[PDB]
Structures are given as C-alpha cells and as structure tokens.
Design an enzyme around this catalytic site. Structure first.
Site, PDB file in Angstrom:
ATOM      1  N   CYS A 163      59.396  22.617 -33.542  1.00 47.60           N
ATOM      2  CA  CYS A 163      59.824  21.304 -33.148  1.00 47.60           C
ATOM      3  C   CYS A 163      61.306  21.077 -33.149  1.00 47.60           C
ATOM      4  O   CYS A 163      61.687  20.112 -32.433  1.00 47.60           O
ATOM      5  CB  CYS A 163      59.190  20.341 -34.093  1.00 47.60           C
ATOM      6  SG  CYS A 163      57.441  20.268 -33.851  1.00 47.60           S
ATOM      7  N   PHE A 214      49.885  16.529 -31.419  1.00 46.57           N
ATOM      8  CA  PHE A 214      50.529  17.427 -30.458  1.00 46.57           C
ATOM      9  C   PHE A 214      49.996  17.294 -29.031  1.00 46.57           C
ATOM     10  O   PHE A 214      48.787  17.267 -28.807  1.00 46.57           O
ATOM     11  CB  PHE A 214      50.388  18.880 -30.914  1.00 46.57           C
ATOM     12  CG  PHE A 214      51.171  19.206 -32.153  1.00 46.57           C
ATOM     13  CD1 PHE A 214      52.553  19.113 -32.160  1.00 46.57           C
ATOM     14  CD2 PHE A 214      50.527  19.621 -33.308  1.00 46.57           C
ATOM     15  CE1 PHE A 214      53.277  19.417 -33.295  1.00 46.57           C
ATOM     16  CE2 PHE A 214      51.245  19.927 -34.448  1.00 46.57           C
ATOM     17  CZ  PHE A 214      52.622  19.825 -34.442  1.00 46.57           C
ATOM     18  N   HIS A 302      63.437  13.494 -32.741  1.00 51.51           N
ATOM     19  CA  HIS A 302      62.149  14.123 -32.509  1.00 51.51           C
ATOM     20  C   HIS A 302      61.051  13.328 -33.213  1.00 51.51           C
ATOM     21  O   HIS A 302      61.097  13.161 -34.434  1.00 51.51           O
ATOM     22  CB  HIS A 302      62.136  15.566 -33.002  1.00 51.51           C
ATOM     23  CG  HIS A 302      60.792  16.213 -32.892  1.00 51.51           C
ATOM     24  ND1 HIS A 302      60.266  16.628 -31.688  1.00 51.51           N
ATOM     25  CD2 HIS A 302      59.854  16.488 -33.829  1.00 51.51           C
ATOM     26  CE1 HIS A 302      59.068  17.146 -31.891  1.00 51.51           C
ATOM     27  NE2 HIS A 302      58.793  17.071 -33.179  1.00 51.51           N
ATOM     28  N   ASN A 335      53.531  14.217 -29.444  1.00 51.69           N
ATOM     29  CA  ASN A 335      54.517  15.181 -29.914  1.00 51.69           C
ATOM     30  C   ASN A 335      54.464  16.467 -29.089  1.00 51.69           C
ATOM     31  O   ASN A 335      53.626  17.339 -29.330  1.00 51.69           O
ATOM     32  CB  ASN A 335      54.285  15.473 -31.402  1.00 51.69           C
ATOM     33  CG  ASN A 335      55.283  16.466 -31.978  1.00 51.69           C
ATOM     34  OD1 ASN A 335      56.133  17.005 -31.271  1.00 51.69           O
ATOM     35  ND2 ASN A 335      55.184  16.703 -33.280  1.00 51.69           N
TER      36      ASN A 335
END
Lengths: 387, 387
Positions: A163, A214, A302, A335
């Site tokens: 990430c 995700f 992020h 994500n």
C-alpha cells in the site's frame, strides 16, 4: 570529453512535474451493501451465520459504497480453490493476474497519454508497480509491448511492495525526471485482488478485513521536468519525498506469497501507530519551508481503512474538508492499494477545476501525499499546486 | 519560499561514483566437475543414464570450476519436494530464501561499508535486488533491520527481475545519488538458487541448463556523488545508463513463479541474439563520447553462459583478454544472476591494483558494463575509471 561535461548536458533543470493522470477499473461493479450475502454465498459459507454477521458489520463500517473487481461469480465458479479459505491456488491466481494487471494498466496509461497530448515515443522511462502477482519478463515488459512504447524505454518493475508504493513510485519518477534532460516518465500502478481473495475463517478475522476493504484499479501518471510551454500542462510539482519505518511497529502488517496465494495479516494497531507518529513526518517535510498549519495544506492520504483517516484527522485536528477527496475515493473504489493515492490526486485536481479554484490543489499552494504500508512504512511526498 | 529554490539546493553536483564494493557467498562450495554425480544422486535420478551424460557435457562446457550454494545435502534431505522436478514446494523454498537472502546480503553490505569507512548512518538510500523469493515487508526492510540502518533510509525493493538487474540497480543508484545532495546509496544484490533448484527431466533440458549454470552470491556497493576528499576513495564513475529490448527476442527467456517454485525456460538462441545486437548498444552509448574502438574500453559483461561471451568476443573481434575478468568470475562462482557484474567490477579493480596499473579500469579510461536477462533485455552502463 570529460565526465563533468556529460553530467552537465545530461541533467534536467526544473522540478519534476505531474503532466497527466489517467485511471481505470474492471467493469464489474460490486456494491458493498450486499457484499456479505454475495461473498458468503460464493465461498459456500452461508452456514456460518455468526461470522456473516461480523462481516456485515465490517462492511457497514468500512465507509465503502462500491468496489470494482476483476473476479466475477463466473470466474470464481471455474476456480473453486480460490473460494476456499486456504487451498492450493497460487497457479490459478497467477494465471489470472499475470495477464489482467498489465491489461488494466494499459487502459490507465492510454488515458494518461491521451490527456498528455504527446506521442508515446516521447516516453523515455516506465515505472510499473503492482502487488498482484510476479513474472519474468514482468508486467513492465508486457505493458511496453501492449502500448507499443519504444524498445529502449528505461523500465523499473516494482513488485510486491503493497500500500505505500503509491508514494514510492512518485519518489522514484521524481529523481528519474529531474536527473535526465528531456525525460518523460510513465508511472503505472495496477492492482488486482484475485491474488488475495479467499474464503472466510472464524479464527482469522484480520483476513476478513481484507475481503471487506481491498478493491481493483489502475492509475497512470506522466512525470517530467522542464515542461514544454503551451504544449504540456503542469498539474502538480514534486518538491520532496521521504520514507520511514515507524517506531515499535515490527510485524504490524505482514503479507506472504504462498501456495494458497497472497495471505494478509494484522498484528498491531495500525491506525494508532500511524496517527501517533504522522506529525513527526509532517514536521520533517515542512519545517524547512516554514509550514506548521496542517490545515493550510491540500491532503492526499492512502485510505487503508476509515480508522486510519479518522484517527489521523482527530490527532491533527484536521477540518473535515481536508480528507474529503481521500474519503470520496475510498467510498467509490475501496482500498486499491498503491493506485489509491493517484486516484485521489486525480480527484483533487478534478474538484479544483470543477469549482473553478485558484490552483489544482484546492486553491492552496502546498500539499502532502501519504502512503502507508508494511513496515510499518510511511511515504511522505511534498507537493506544490499549479495556478 | 519557491519550489525552484528548493530544487537548486536539493541536487548534487558531480557524477555518481562507486566508493566501495563488497561480496559474499554461502560457505558451502560445490565442485562443478563432479556436480552431475552429486546432483543426480541427491535428486534420486541415478537411473537416468543418458540424461546424466548430457548434463555432464553441459557442466563440462559451462566453463564453471565451482559454485557456492545455500542448499546442502542435509537441507535437501529435509525438503524432498525440492529435489523432484515438479512437486509442490514453494512454501518450503520461500521459508528458506526469505531469511537467507537478506542474511547473505548483510554479509556483503558489511564488507562494503567497512571499505567505505563512513558510519552506516550516512547511508540515505537502499536499493535491494533479488530474483529469489518475495515477501512483505521485503528483503530491504529485513536488511535495514539487521544492518541497523536509519529508520528513514529511502528504500527501493527490486523483486524478480533476473540477470539484467545488475545494470538496473546501477542505473537507479546513479539517479538517486546525482539528484540528491549528500546522498549515499547502498546497493545490494543477493541471489539464492533454492527457488530454482529442482530434479532433472528428460524433456526439459533448458531447465537443466540452469542447474548447470546458476550459483549463489551477494554483492554490495556504496554509490554517491561529490565524494569527500581524503576520507572517501572513488573507484569508478557512472557516466550513462541505458536499457533496451532486443528485436525478435520475444519469449527468449521466461521465468514463472509457481507452486513448484521458480521455473526457467529458453526458447531462442540467446547468444546469437545478444551478439547480433550488442554493437547497436555500444554505438548508442559511445558515439556521443567519440569512441568506436571497443578494445579501448575495459569490459564488464554478465556471464549468462560461456556461449554468450564467446560469440560477443568474435562478433566484435575483441582481444581475448578483454573478457578476462568476466570469465574469471564465471569460473570461480558460476552465474550468480544480478550480482555477477558487481563481482566482476570488483575483480577488475583488484586485478588492476595487483598489476599496478594506472587506473582502476585495467589502465584504461572508459569502460562498459552489460547486463542480459528476460526480455530479452540488455542494460548498458558507460563507466569511467579513476587514476
């Protein structure tokens, strides 16, 4: 001729500059509201009623509305070992992502190149990043072949970083662009959760977190110094880039590539660790240029999960508006690992343009881009907006 | 405060410079002359007479005298799936190399740092390269941890690239050092064949080539611009760095990471492709410098195999002693993939000092460094010696 003379003629003059941004996702849009019903059905786990209740709570609190996934019900019906919590499935997963990753990357790259407006033969460098699968030759080679880039493009293949790599690739492209005259760097991050998708387990809830958060997506950026006037259009300037490992964060996040695919493990309080230490990175980055008010910056962070955003917001007393662009992307894409911060960067200049603001950075001069990942690693990129 | 102002104070002045070279191997030395007997014994294939005969001729032609291998007979006994040609064994292989790769890398890094003479806290960047396994966090994190580097060291993890990466890491470190004032880059390449080692197969002789050629090893280099007078001792200068994919070389060398570990495939005449195209890279790199005689250069070439060296030598009409240092490394270590050219670079300067020559580049001024690998990819680095 001397080496000093070559060095002089070889290097660029100005700061690395974002010249274009393009994004892409798989076509299959999966809404979060009913994902637990869908997920527990395709993984043949509908009998695990209490665990499904837990997952429903995870998804409801994920602050994700939808994700895009390469994996469909059809594909998963043809790959039953992927639906298991842990069954041999790496080969099946690799066969998928070795093709899909560069394919999706091409879509993002094409859009970025289209916006850019220059012939693709002017691309001199390619930085490709992914956490989904590995292969030789790599996805960088495949993309070069799919796009029809020059065979002498200077490639850098960044596998299995996770990430934080969204910050890493910018940090890389910056030095490539600034140290090489006429250099134009194509950066591509492409992520496909086919390598990490798996069935649920009662005693491994941290793996379930992954299934809730995700998503898939690819983002591409063109970076170069010394922009051609009139022809090229600067969006952002890359001022500086730092990376560090957080104190007392050993083993907080671990990911292993095994015969069962890519596994995901959470041991420590990631939101707590990031929020506890993030101001130190802000000081290091901005003290040189005399900035201490973090609300005076435009933000890209992020969105590993909503808890990271909430606790960073709380710790620094950020206004709700600061992480709006971040939360927007999390809400609409989930994500997407390394590609996320580039989607968010695209969102910031979009809303800035739409609102008719003074700069591409929400009307502000300076900004910061954060990547968080295994380490625990924090990437910090200082940004400057464009008029 | 302006971005332009930051950029001018941020960059370094001079060319990237090699300040130290350190190398390391596993302690277990394997004799090439008797390797066919040993290999076919430990892989329980002694009954395969005709194939063993072929492998003996491969090893005899390899021009390798010995190799160093982490894999011992003891370890192979405890991991029988690794001895078979194709058996599920990736988890066993990963468990080995996730540890050994950074361990051997630290061994090489410690030597380089000792020669360098500066505190390891002066290391600002880490480039770690390996084709042996993947993990999150990666070998770069583990090395940073083991070696005690500063937490804010700027890391670049390069996984699964293969044999050309020796040039890639130098190309990378070059831009990192030259674009950042005070930057000192630790480059580490560490390779362990435990991921590719497998039993022999009648109908996959290209895989058998790998078993004859590949050995283990690690090399480390300190690279920086603007060397401090007296305290730091320059060895080589990095002038320029190029990369390209050869024509009609599609699928010449493939490597797939699967449940059986890392597989290895050959499909085209690799020696023929390199020899046929290498002069284009030489001209592209040296026409600007005003050099056309390749015998006036000191040479470093990845010893992928003896055939490549022999055909490049005749094609360019190189004097036989030009590839002396290259062949010496191949003889004593075999093909250690990305680490090879760094061993050879070390061989060249040691050999030059031992001969009492006027420069670190065999008494010559300009040199060239080649990496060959999957693509088929070629990396070309122009070097300049030091008096």
């Amino acid at each position: 001729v001397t080496v000093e003379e070559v060095r002089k003629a070889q290097r660029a003059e100005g700061p690395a500059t974002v010249l274009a941004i393009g994004t892409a996702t798989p076509s299959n849009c999966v809404d979060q509201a009913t994902y637990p019903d869908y997920y527990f059905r395709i993984t043949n786990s509908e009998h695990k009623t209490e665990l499904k209740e837990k997952f429903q709570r995870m998804c409801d609190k994920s602050m994700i509305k939808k994700r895009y996934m390469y994996l469909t019900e059809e594909i998963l019906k043809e790959n039953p070992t992927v639906c298991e919590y842990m069954a041999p499935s790496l080969d099946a997963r690799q066969d998928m992502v070795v093709v899909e990753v560069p394919r999706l990357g091409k879509e993002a790259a094409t859009k970025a190149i289209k916006e850019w407006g220059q012939p693709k033969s002017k691309i001199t460098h390619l930085v490709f990043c992914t956490t989904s699968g590995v292969d030789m030759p790599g996805a960088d080679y495949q993309l070069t072949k799919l796009l029809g880039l020059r065979p002498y493009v200077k490639r850098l293949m960044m596998y299995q970083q996770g990430c934080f790599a969204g910050g890493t690739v910018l940090r890389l492209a910056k030095d490539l662009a600034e140290n090489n005259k006429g250099a134009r760097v194509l950066v591509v991050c492409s992520e496909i959760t086919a390598v990490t998708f798996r069935g649920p387990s009662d005693t491994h809830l941290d793996s379930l977190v992954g299934q809730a958060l995700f998503g898939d997506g690819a983002a591409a950026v063109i970076i170069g110094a010394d922009p051609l006037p009139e022809v090229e259009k600067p969006l952002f300037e890359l001022v500086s880039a730092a990376q560090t490992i957080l104190p007392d964060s050993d083993g907080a996040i671990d990911g292993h590539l095994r015969e069962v695919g890519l596994t995901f493990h959470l041991l420590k309080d990631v939101p707590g660790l990031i929020s506890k230490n993030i101001e130190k990175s802000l000081n290091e980055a901005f003290k040189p240029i005399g900035i201490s008010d973090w609300n005076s910056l435009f933000w890209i962070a992020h969105p590993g999960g909503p808890a990271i955003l909430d606790q960073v917001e709380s710790k620094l007393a950020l206004k709700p508006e600061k992480l709006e662009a971040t939360r927007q992307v999390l809400s609409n894409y989930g994500n997407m690992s390394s590609a996320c911060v580039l989607f968010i960067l695209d969102e910031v200049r979009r809303k800035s343009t739409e609102k008719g603001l003074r700069t591409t950075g929400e009307g502000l001069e300076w900004g910061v881009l954060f990547g968080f990942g295994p380490g625990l690693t924090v990437e910090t990129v200082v940004l400057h907006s464009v008029a």
